[PDB]
Symmetry: C3
Subunit: 277 residues, 3 copies
């Protein structure tokens, strides 16, 4: 029972719940195709400071059930809601990275901002990644179709190539790649379901969060790297911070997509300052 909850639809969601029971809560939502382990640097920082931290694995990711369907933002939000309802942690600060930032926004829209004191979108997918007739600066759909085809063709290799190349900026001049960071990304991706991750690409890239964002009146902090090769800065973080009612943007100059790892100390300090504000 410690660290698992079963949703209404029979999906087992794994979670970490660390720290004093009566401390202020921060709930973290990870990106594609990873797990709650991707927050390790943040979870350790906060728990060592006396806070309570919660972080769960999205359906079909990490240690959560390899359910074949429901791989969309509405289900992701409801699965998050199942964790919050079990733990009684309403009023938490909710922090998302990448796809997880979409999940945070949909959680707020679907289950109500009364239950979230503050939100943070780190390197997050909103408002809409894919190019459409009404989103002409987006990324062409074929880009995502190709990510899907890579997952289908050789997921094992693709999950080395992404973290070795664009995700942490290890393909840039001056980069100091960490083999452990690369293999750790891979390890998390591979324990998840190929089907959940394959469908998951559509969920993150082709869900429009613009309406959800506009309904958010609670304090929102947006943190984004301006050399993000995975979720382009100009078409995500910059827009999200303006669409919400009470948003603020912190730009990490030169930073990649995987800033919870590469810029952990900055992220930790910025999250703490926002939590205490």
């Amino acid at each position: 029972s410690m660290g698992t909850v079963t949703t209404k639809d029979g999906v087992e969601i794994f979670y970490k719940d660390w720290g004093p029971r009566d401390a202020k809560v921060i709930h973290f939502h990870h990106g594609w195709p990873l797990s709650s382990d991707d927050w390790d640097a943040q979870l350790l920082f906060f728990v060592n400071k006396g806070f309570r931290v919660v972080a769960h694995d999205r359906r079909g990711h990490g240690r959560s059930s390899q359910v074949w369907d429901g791989h969309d933002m509405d289900h992701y939000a409801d699965d998050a809601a199942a964790v919050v309802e079990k733990l009684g942690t309403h009023g938490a600060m909710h922090v998302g990275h990448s796809t997880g930032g979409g999940e945070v926004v949909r959680y707020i829209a679907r289950h109500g901002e009364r239950n979230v004191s503050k939100a943070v979108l780190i390197s997050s997918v909103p408002p809409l990644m894919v190019k459409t007739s009404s989103n002409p600066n987006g990324t062409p759909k074929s880009v995502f179709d190709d990510f899907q085809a890579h997952v289908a063709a050789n997921r094992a290799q693709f999950y080395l190539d992404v973290p070795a190349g664009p995700f942490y900026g290890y393909n840039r001049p001056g980069a100091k790649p960490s083999e452990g960071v690369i293999y750790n990304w891979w390890r998390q991706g591979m324990m998840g379901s190929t089907k959940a991750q394959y469908d998951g690409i559509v969920a993150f890239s082709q869900t429009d969060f613009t309406n959800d964002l506009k309904g958010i009146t609670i304090p929102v902090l947006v943190i984004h790297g301006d050399d993000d090769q995975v979720v382009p800065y100009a078409d995500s973080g910059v827009l999200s911070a303006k669409l919400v009612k009470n948003g603020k943007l912190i730009t990490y100059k030169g930073a990649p997509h995987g800033i919870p790892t590469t810029h952990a100390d900055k992220v930790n300090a910025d999250l703490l300052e926002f939590l205490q504000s």
Copy 2:
């Protein structure tokens, strides 16, 4: 609970069950020393086409319990039956790779071909791998004794060397090894039980499936690479296809042992054509 069943002898068997509940079913049985993750390319292909796919982890392999005994084909077959019993998927097409093809044969013989509509043996161990005074064309037992000695001596290194060398033909000139494929094979092996896998060598190499095969009258498709360095083509698939009553052999010229990965597109197309036949 989703994706586990406890057998009547107390073993928890992990499985994936993906796709529409009323669709035609394909059940897949993996090889040594791997897990149901070895079928990812196939599972994704079939689920995306609207079929229902089931794939379980052998006892002591993958996410299934590290039970110390019963590492033989009869128990492997009985563990498969426990999955089919829970899910009600009698009448499925059963597909085995490598050791898993032995499991499929023993499952049919022990639980009855009335419960299987069609069977596919990919790179599979039957009829009898090991050389005996009465199987003079087989592989000397010393070979399998040496595999066991390597498992006992340094399993972690052995499980890099096998996929980096003979399993996918990456030791052949001009081959393009995939680091991710090699590490994924390793990852699946190392999560399983050293004892299950040690005993499992005997199970796959020293079980005689000849009588079981002769009793199979349902349609059987045999797929086998003629450059298979792990299960020699001439003493396995060539023979199995002739021993069953209604068998057909497809030979993949040049192909290694790990054809679900290296020849995924051919496997998928051949499996689909047979399923629809």
Copy 3:
């Protein structure tokens, strides 16, 4: 349920229990930051000889619950007692490596030597690693603070650097590193909780077992490498063997910390001789 027990404080402990139900039992206690998989070479050796072997994963390690607190030797001992109580294996020989040797000592002290026939401390942390007024030759606390800072900074990379360097002596001239051994150490570490492991450094380095050791009257064997870079030989095994009432020391000349792996055949032989004595 095969292989899991839930403690009084709600922690799920993973264990392996292999071999004939009525055979003499050997219970193994692994080191930091690993799991019961670190014992593979010993478990296989003894089960193949017809003994019963038990090995559990420490809280927040391996497959055990990622509980945030109780990362201290008293709780480690109590969690081990939970496994013994479920299995009824009182009277076993208890073998610890590294941190696990401390856990064996505190288990004996807290739960009583009446429940342990013989104990073995391989490369173990007792009596006390850190420098103090009464342990003047111990390791400065700053060394352990620095380990904790590495875990906090980049656990993924630190867990390659430890096994690739000091743990197996692969940093010594003429050493023959095994990539599989290095990655397997890493694999075990990363599946555990960063918090359990961060706190666990204090538990192993900063717990005084002197009075526990002085109270042990059962036969104790200490095995320790004299080139151990992780737990210095002169301030650990040499002392523990003299503080217990009935202790014997076997020194492996030139040997590193990771002797269950590097010196497996010697360890297996010395354990079997002690067990039969």
